[PDB]
């Protein structure tokens, strides 16, 4: 799932961390944390984490949030990777700290996206682009 990239996949993979990394929910829904289970499309090989997306969809969970949203897996969307990258451009976007949002399995983000969102992510997921006034 979902899947819709992009055109392209907005080029190479970069992560803040793979499996077992907290990033904030950045969402009006009362998920307060997002912890990764795994990432979609990772086919992977012998001993290698299923590694965080640059703006791609993930199997996640609400570890600390609303108890209703707590437990039960959730497809999400990575929004900003603390750990850095170069783009086809020659810039190195880098962030304060990791972040994403909990989302629908057609990609759609629920409420409104908080804070700054890398443009690649927006490009990937049109709903994301729609539901924010910050796309930097």
């Amino acid at each position: 799932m979902s899947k819709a990239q992009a055109v392209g996949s907005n080029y190479r993979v970069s992560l803040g961390l793979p499996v077992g990394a907290v990033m904030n929910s950045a969402d009006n829904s009362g998920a307060k944390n997002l912890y990764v289970i795994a990432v979609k499309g990772i086919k992977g090989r012998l001993n290698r984490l299923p590694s965080a997306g640059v703006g791609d969809m993930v199997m996640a969970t609400v570890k600390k949030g609303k108890p209703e949203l707590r437990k039960k897996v959730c497809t999400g969307l990575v929004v900003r990777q603390r750990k850095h990258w170069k783009r086809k451009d020659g810039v190195y976007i880098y962030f304060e700290d990791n972040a994403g949002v909990m989302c629908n399995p057609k990609g759609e983000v629920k409420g409104n996206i908080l804070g700054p969102v890398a443009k690649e992510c927006s490009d990937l997921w049109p709903k994301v682009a729609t539901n924010a006034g910050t796309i930097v």
């Binding site: 992009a6 055109v7 392209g8 907005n10 086809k88 451009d89 020659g90 490009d123």
Partner: peptide, 18 residues
Amino acid sequence: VVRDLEKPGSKMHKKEIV
């Protein structure tokens, strides 16, 4: 070097890239 690239079909057909 920066060069604007010629490969339409891309996310942008012409765009600066190092």
